[PDB]
């Protein structure tokens, strides 16, 4: 799925 | 902010995110962060919905609100430390929001990585670790997480260090 998906804390 | 972005966009992203399944995509969180930020004048409804969000499902919801608050976290930590991050009692402001925070972070994160697996438990931990570093929670570890029986606990069937 093309949505920026994973979001790391590590990186804002 | 002439009723423009209030809690109508807040709340739509978290509910929109549920929604999903099991995507979380990084733009909700955005755009929940951002408004946050944007409104320090609403802390309380803002942390109290996301920490309820966490609690409410199982690991679901508890992975995907964990996130959440997480860069809500940061964000906020960082603007009231700019002046000066006091509270005592009740929402009101950034400080008073991580305060409250800290004061669930317990049942949220303990619950979060128990109901969670290897797989999600471990992006619990690491995030967990991140923490620390940053500067986030300076509690010197919470009884919450403190108590390494709680990996070591919910940690199904598996070998590790």
Redesign the interface.
Known sequence: ?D?????N??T? | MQQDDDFQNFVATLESFKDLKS?????R?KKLTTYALDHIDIESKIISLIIDYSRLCPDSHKLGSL?II??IG?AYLDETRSNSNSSSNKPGTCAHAINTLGEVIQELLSDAIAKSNQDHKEKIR??LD??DRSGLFQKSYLNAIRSKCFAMDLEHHHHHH
């Open positions: 799925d949505d920026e998906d994973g979001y804390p590590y804002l | 995507g979380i995509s990084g733009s969180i996130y997480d860069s940061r690491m995030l991140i923490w």
